[PDB]
Assembly symmetry: C5
Homo-oligomer: 376 residues x 5
């Protein structure tokens, strides 16, 4: 993931022009090879026309170039690219939102699974580790980087997400399908056992734990479904074919013809199609956005940092359920205990924000007449 | 379903060009017959013009071709295709999301329906099988492949989704409408009975089971509604008529007229409309995307694997509720029990991912001045 | 509702061309009168130009036709039609989804309202009938067909949805607004009474019943809101005016001028504007899609079959809550009781679907190197 | 709100042409002054050109008109208008859906807050009145009509939504922000008190009441957020500037030049720009749609009838929680008590709908071969 | 945030023209520097052409201008800008909706955490302060203004959102990731402790508190995710490059060539490209909408007022949970206690709203025939 939010916090005079100077996760990095190939083909055709063809061959080539230039209709390609890229971007954001996070489960566990002793610690840590293991299994199923990190269930066990006995049971389970749900069923069984033992003090807490677990498991399953059901191959091929057809038409009919021939719209020979190159840049980059976002779990610069997320989630959940459990600071009266109102201080760099009128509603400046305000 | 996520994990130099080489679920497979018919009509008209018509007939044909060439306005057809295809694709993804999955119900059942004996096994397996039977009934109602697999309720019974007594009760129920909800009502009655017998230990567990069952039944009903309420036939016919009108205009006005006649924009005779064929490819494939996705339960390559989903769901739910029940590995301390922090190891192929700074927020590089930091 | 899902299950060579032959709920049925009027106006103008006007009048008419043909800008009309029709179609699907269905309530009632005696039957049937009566009241408020079926509350009572005492109370209620919520309040009161009497065995069951009732009532209220808040009349008039302006410009400037006059782009006289007629077909049908879907509760072919829905819902809910309750086949071991795995048989017509590899994840073909798999 | 749903129930031959004759909440009413100003400027320029300018000034004016006519690019303005108006319309529907309604809360209160005596009546009525008062406070904050109805909290008290003691407490609360949430906090306190006294009979009922209250308060807060966070002023100004630029270009370059001068595309002088006025009508109305819907709480014809909603909600909630409480008609057997099936009668005007086959699924006409149905 | 809702409450003759006069958060303020730079470059090129170039250089410059003017294709740039800006605006509204508000939690706390003594006050105030502290932590992570207000956790402590003991625990927590969730875990622990002590009187209330806390924490996490996952840098760079390419083509090919040269479409020299400047205004402002909204937590005029939101939330939550707890006005009969109906009075300025018929449904004007109403 390439983050530039701090660079675009304010709308500045430089603005996106300064973003144009970034290399990592950039259009230049994604497209320079294709740009070189396009320019090489164009320059090869130009050199052939200038130095290889005879007079008759050059006349026929000029006729063909004029013919091809009339098919450079970029409105249909813009339509298809816009709709396809919008679909891909929305699917990309949905896939990111389908990533399983243990924050809700960890809050629920810290608030519902009790016991400061080793057995309570074991319950909380095991539940959080089951959630993390389900996330890791689905992520190694769907993400190339996570699979590289955990190429085998042996790697999963060594990482600490699964134990040896749990691995034995996991392998003994006879199933030909992805087993990312097995830790979720383990979580359900362990929550039921903890409720039966009294570690979970009420059926309402058990129901809350199971609801949060169902949310987490549903997110994992949504990740699996996004991995399985790809964006229609026919749609992807249609968009690629449209772009390639337009680029072929441009690369043929954008050749600089001889000015001496007196053709319409061909009287200046720049030897380098600056605007055709810019059009290729814009449209190929529009397609490269979809190319990069189509599988957001690869090793692109803008692809999701699933390994970092795994580490963060595991550490945070373990902290919340083990070290932060029942260690609240003693209840003490806060700063504004005797203050009727409450407003925190402003700094010298933000005090200007004050004196801005507090918004109360759009209708509090009407100032009607007296007789219009009288009830009937 | 045609899956190419691993092929597009990273944005590579090849990119979608390698996808252009795929045949299954491909635009070529979907459109080669239509392309052949289009090219045959075009070549028939061209051969007639070249070899059959007299001089006057050829003159009139050239006039007609020039006339029809000015009605080749692809912007409206692009508009209609874009909007219609976007609607169809969104409806396709929604329909896929409406498929009933037993994962949540199976987790809840393993957590809440108790008893390691035969009666507890029967309760859990019967509930899971009722969910699976409702899914199978709706799927055989809405999907051609599932119907071919289960052409009759006799096939349903032989597959083990329904028993003979259950089939007796199902046929005895007097209803002229689809009965996919009968297993859901049986699930409600069985959950109530299990709660009454103490198998379900609390009203909260019963409520959770009923909520999950209602979600599952609502998904089945959503599948039925999507099957019933087709995309407006008027809209489909409008889009088809627009595409066919454009293709007729192209097939008449893209004819290669005699260069000897000195017509404007007709000076080169390629004998093969390469760019008209490419435009046909692009637009016909754009429509074929909707053609394939309009009923995602057919037997297209990209249509949903409903039978595979049935098998997977049934086996996984049976495993979770029968073999996975109350067989947790003995609670054991994990790898990071004594470790204050927690971070799993990286492999040599992904260790490069480390040294990437951990994202803390976009505001943690501002580095303000000292006096601006002071509270008022 | 016109259903053609089975016709489009697979993407076939015929495809939507076969749909073009359907009459019910079709563009031809919706638009043939408008097409006849357009063609009549066009032919009247053409006949006047050919046979009525003098030479000077014909010259001025040719000038006017040339002038009008330059305002045939269809891109803005395509934009407005696309956006307006997309809004209308989305609103149409949302309105369909807002249709009240009793499936969830009937499952909850069969599971929570108990008693095989007459009083329990009365409780369940009365609750389901209250839900059905609220649905019928809102539907007769919002749908012309349902109102024609139930022109009066006397019709509602005779249909069996309301009793005489209930009608007395309903009329005694002093309200000047729609009373579709009165059955929902009756449902709340009756559920509370049943819980008090012990028919509903727990507060969790009562809460589940009230939540399902609130969902149902909210759907009824959404139907009322969709009926009340129409798509903006200004927007509808804008779209209609744009379409009519374009069609007037076409009907004037698409006249076939005399070829003898030697006008640019006017040298062939077909006597029948085939392509203008096709353009009118496409755009008028695009508008007719919104015209039909704007009120999906009328009596169009593609409008919702609300009376069928009412009958189906009432019959199914009565069956579920009266005959189905406490009627479960004796718990019996299923086909795969002793089978570790579970997979139903395939038919000879679908066995080909097997041998398709089971999808496990997109990362399970990477096949990395040995030294890259080693943990740091 | 202008309602025309009954007029568009069916797709008729007249259709939207009849809506074109409606004045209230219409494009004519919204745009006739702007149309008059546009036509006045155009006619002033035309009269100046015809009767004021000298020959040289007229020649320069014709050159300027020809120059300005080449910037009449309506595609970008169509793009911007379409996207901006779609955003505004979606925001308008969301704002309407954010309007607080007491139907769910009143059903829950009638079901859960008990006591037929004066104290139970007081509890129910006070809870419903707190909800109504919160709605009224937010509505008078955000809506000009509601503010004019209730210019002061004294007006609120006299209307009956607030008492004198409650007004004293509400003014005593020391807050510089909108206090629409104070009635919601009062509702929470009163529900807790009723639960403590046993008027609410269970913790599940109390939790359901609090959930419904949170939904209602969230809708009120959403209304406040929509009022505060306007559509970006930069976006609104951009759209307005684009429209005005296009209209200036049209008003200059659409002048009817002298035919005697023999300019290309200027040989007919109609003395009135019929098509330019039509384009102005269409585009200015497209923008007027957003102008009207941008704040749907003003006093436009199509703006929401918030005062009617207030009256309806208050009366209906009071009826439901006071007069409808525990006054169910005696449980009696319905019409279909002894009928296995259930179908209400049809009228002579709708009996035609019968004989339409009942939809069972899209796969129930396949009629496969016998040997294809055989399980492997 | 710039609020102009009250200015656009009604669709008026002035309309958005009056909005065009606003400076704060306006297109002029966002774009005048870029406009000055564009005009300076254009005027520099024009002055060079007029006063520096030789005759041959001017001829070549005219050739280049003519060549560049035919690449001014604004349809693709409009497409890309429209889609990108729509994505950015939708993400902006979603980010605003993801801002944590304490209203629901404060209502739940006032209703469920009991005790009028110091310990109950401490419980309620501490829970509300934990929610506020989590919001403040996430907001200082993601927002430049909030970070400037709270550059350090010392600033957080001085503001009263965190105490010294809580700060010590917060720093002792060993985590390398953002700790905005620590107050949420503290909230869970404190709620569990209060339930165990009896301050929270039921498991249902504890579950409601934890559900509201999970909603709040999920909103905070959504804010973090929006901050981290920026809009694709490739997409942003593509849009910027397209805009800059179009503006370069315009700044070259929109030069006013010498009329004496007799070029097509170059016979009038205005010396100032009014329409090119207007096009730059429109498109640069369309991009500036995205520039301003891309990070809505910066210090733009239209950016969210997060500091005001923090102050308001803290003040309101403290009021609700401390001062408004269990101080309801004594239950008293309301104004309409004996009134069968209920309708508040209208003022003289809104009584006109009456006499509008109450909407009952769209089918209540059909007025069918007698014999059509008869049941079969
Ligand atoms: Ca990728
Ligand atoms: Ca299909
Ligand atoms: Ca209709
Ligand atoms: Ca308004
Ligand atoms: Ca900003
Ligand atoms: Cl609950």
């Amino acid at each position: 993931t390439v983050t530039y939010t701090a660079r675009v916090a304010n709308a500045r005079f430089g603005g996106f022009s300064q973003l144009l100077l970034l290399w990592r996760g950039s259009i230049y990095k994604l497209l320079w090879r294709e740009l070189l190939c396009f320019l090489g083909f164009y320059m090869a055709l130009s050199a052939a026309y200038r130095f290889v063809l005879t007079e008759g061959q050059k006349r026929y080539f000029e006729k063909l170039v004029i013919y091809c230039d009339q098919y450079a209709s970029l409105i249909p390609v813009s339509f298809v690219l816009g709709f396809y890229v919008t679909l891909v971007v929305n699917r990309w954001w949905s896939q990111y939102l389908c990533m399983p996070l243990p924050d809700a489960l960890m809050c629920v566990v810290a608030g519902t699974v009790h016991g400061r002793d080793d057995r309570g610690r074991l319950y909380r840590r095991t539940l959080m580790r089951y959630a993390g293991l389900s996330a890791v299994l689905i992520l190694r199923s769907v993400s190339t980087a996570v699979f590289k990190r955990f190429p085998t269930i042996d790697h999963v066990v060594e990482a600490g997400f699964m134990t040896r006995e749990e691995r034995k049971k996991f392998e003994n389970l006879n199933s030909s399908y992805n087993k990312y749900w097995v830790p979720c069923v383990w979580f359900s069984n362990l929550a039921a056992q903890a409720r039966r033992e009294g570690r979970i003090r009420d059926n309402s807490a058990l129901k809350l734990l199971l609801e949060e677990l169902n949310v987490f498991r549903g997110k994992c399953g949504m990740l699996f479904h996004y991995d399985w059901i790809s964006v229609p191959l026919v749609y992807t091929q249609v968009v690629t074919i449209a772009l390639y057809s337009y680029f072929l038409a441009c690369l043929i009919g954008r050749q600089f013809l001889d000015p001496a021939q007196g053709y319409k719209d061909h009287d200046l020979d720049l030897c380098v199609p600056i605007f055709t190159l810019l059009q290729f840049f814009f449209y190929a980059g529009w397609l490269k956005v979809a190319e990069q976002l189509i599988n957001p779990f690869g090793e692109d610069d803008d692809d999701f940092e699933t390994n970092f997320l795994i580490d963060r989630n595991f550490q945070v959940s373990m902290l919340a359920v083990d070290e932060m459990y029942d260690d609240l600071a003693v209840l003490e009266k806060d700063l504004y205990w005797d203050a009727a109102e409450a407003r925190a201080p402003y700094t010298a760099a933000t005090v200007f924000q004050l004196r801005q009128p507090s918004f109360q509603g759009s209708t509090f400046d009407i100032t009607l007449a007296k007789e219009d305000m009288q009830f009937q």
